[PDB]
Design a protein around this ligand. Structure first.
Ligand SMILES: [Cu+]
Lengths: 50, 50
C-alpha cells in the first residue's frame, strides 16, 4: 500500500549536478476504486497467490 | 642563495618563504592572480572546453 498503490520514492538518479527521483508502483488499473484495492494481488513469502 | 644552489633535485621548483606567511597563504583559499575569470557550469567537460 505504501509503494504498489502508493509511489514512494526508492532512489535518485544522478546526472552531473541534477538529481531525479525514481518511482515504484503498480499501474493505475489497480488504483481507481476501493474494490480495485480489495483485489490487489500479493505474493506472500510462501510463494502463494493472495 | 646558498640554500637554493645546494638543494637541486629533478621534479622540484624550490620556494623559500617565512613559516607564518606560508601558513597564511596555505589557508588562504582564494585567487592570487590579478584578474580571474570563473566559468561555472553543470558538468566539467563543457566548462573545460569553454
Ligand atoms: Cu603548501
Amino acid at each position: 500500500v505504501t509503494s504498489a498503490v502508493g509511489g514512494a520514492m526508492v532512489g535518485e538518479t544522478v546526472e552531473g549536478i541534477a538529481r531525479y527521483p525514481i518511482n515504484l508502483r503498480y499501474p493505475q488499473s489497480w488504483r481507481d476504486s476501493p474494490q480495485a484495492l480489495r483485489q490487489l494481488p500479493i505474493l506472500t513469502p510462501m510463494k502463494q497467490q493472495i | 642563495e646558498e640554500l637554493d644552489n645546494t638543494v637541486r633535485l629533478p621534479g622540484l621548483a624550490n620556494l623559500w618563504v617565512p613559516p607564518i606567511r606560508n601558513r597564511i597563504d596555505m589557508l588562504s583559499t582564494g585567487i592570487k592572480s590579478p584578474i580571474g575569470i570563473k566559468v561555472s557550469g553543470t558538468v566539467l567537460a563543457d566548462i573545460d572546453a569553454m
